[PDB]
Each structure stands twice: as C-alpha cells, then as structure tokens.
C-alpha cells in the first residue's frame, strides 16, 4: 500500500499546509475506442455454400 504524505492537524487557530516547492509536467495517455470494425455477412453463403 503506497501511503500518502501524512499531514498533521494542529491544536491551534493555524493549520499545516503541505505545499509543492517543485513541479513537473507529465502526460497521461488515454485511448478511447469510438468504433468497431463494420462487418456484414452473406449468411446464405456462409451457412450453405
């Protein structure tokens, strides 16, 4: 289990801010299928030749 960064709450009127000091860009790649191959069948030929 990959634990998240633990950030403690404070007993006060203040709060802890876990804030980045660095960054990177990255690319999430995603494929979405929109079609399937369209097929027709000559059923009479398929079955009886």
């Amino acid at each position: 289990f990959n634990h998240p960064i633990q950030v403690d709450q404070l007993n006060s009127s203040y709060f802890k801010l876990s804030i980045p000091t660095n960054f990177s860009f990255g690319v999430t790649q995603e494929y979405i299928q929109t079609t399937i191959q369209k097929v027709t069948v000559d059923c009479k030929q398929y079955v009886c030749n």
């Binding site: 027709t40 069948v41 000559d42 009479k44 030929q45």
Partner: protein
Amino acid sequence: FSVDGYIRRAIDCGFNDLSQLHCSYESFDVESGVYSVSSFEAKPSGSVV
C-alpha cells in the same frame, strides 16, 4: 396478395441485387441506404479430376 387474394405485384428475388434487398425486408418499399446483399458468385467454368 391483394385483399381479394390475387397476386398483382411480385419481386423475383434472384433477378438483381435491388430485388434481393426487397425480398430480405419482405417489402416493396424499403428505406434509402446502402445495404449488403448476397455476393455475386463465381461459378465453375469446368472441372479437374
């Protein structure tokens, strides 16, 4: 078949591809579109033994 039972109109379902279309929908009126129909068969030109 008319109300009086006589046949006044018919389709020869093997005449052409358009006729095959009408027969597959069992109707003299089908909607516009592009439809697959039975393939045009290659026929033997002889035999080998």
